[PDB]
Write a protein that binds this ligand. Sequence first.
Ligand SMILES: Nc1ncnc2c1ncn2[C@@H]1O[C@H](COP(=O)(O)OP(=O)(O)OC[C@H]2O[C@@H](O)[C@H](O)[C@@H]2O)[C@@H](O)[C@H]1O
Ligand SMILES: [Zn+2]
Length: 286
Amino acid sequence: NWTTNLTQAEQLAQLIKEADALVVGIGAGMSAADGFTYIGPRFETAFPDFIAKYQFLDMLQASLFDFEDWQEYWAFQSRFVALNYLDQPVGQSYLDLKEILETKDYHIITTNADNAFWVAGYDPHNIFHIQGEYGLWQCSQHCHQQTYKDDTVIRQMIAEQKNMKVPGQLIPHCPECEAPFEINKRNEEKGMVEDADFHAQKARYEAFLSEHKEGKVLYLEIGVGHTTPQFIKHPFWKRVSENPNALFVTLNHKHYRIPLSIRRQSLELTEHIAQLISATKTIYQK
Ligand SMILES: Nc1ncnc2c1ncn2[C@@H]1O[C@H](COP(=O)(O)OP(=O)(O)OC[C@H]2O[C@@H](O)[C@H](O)[C@@H]2O)[C@@H](O)[C@H]1O
Ligand SMILES: [Zn+2]
């Protein structure tokens, strides 16, 4: 029953059913599993200019690169936003997970910044985008705590750029301090602009955690790696340690070693996320 000869999907379906509540942590693996990849042909097709000039290995690296000027920054990012936010289609695993979660008390924290939850029709009140969203902008000097958006300008930038540069007059500027806008993204050194909406999401997430300090709480970690373990992986480990009745279930095709404190409360499921979620949904629905 509630315990870490069944298939991975059978084991997952049963735990979800049995859980009092689910705390679901989603990282880049879930998007990669639906084909929203950041290395290979998807990246090569979309950015052959930038790859030819900078020898970028992957789209994450390129999205973090300190470009020479804001004209180049916005040429790259406008296209990046269109690929992963304006025009990214619905992923089947986001739809399959949503159906499973419909019958459960749950909350989601995600380090992903793509459109995946929105095109899959999730209630925004149930999701905490701790790393911001590609569709949003912030003052590059973080001069005040407000995010902005303007998809029309993004499309202008895609249309008007040439030679990896947006025309200067199209670069958007913070109305308070006139610094250029940048993507709402968390820097290690400078942090992230966290506006009223961000704090509302955080408070909802913290509320849910406060309500589920006890009981059969399933901490379900999907496609979370080592890139930024401080947001999901490590906090989950700690929650599971602090509640002896919690379980830690990680959906990941690579092995990340689990702390000694929670070895007996942990389960690693290595099946390809898309396949696993699909098979789990099928079982869970019978
Ligand atoms: N099909 C799959 N099935 C199962 N696991 C998978 C699959 N595809 C990828 N994974 C796993 O998903 C994980 C992705 O890890 P990272 O690339 O570290 O992604 P993430 O944990 O989300 O960290 C990314 C960090 O950088 C920022 O872009 C982002 O905002 C976040 O803070 C890896 O452990 C990988 O093994
Ligand atoms: Zn400003």
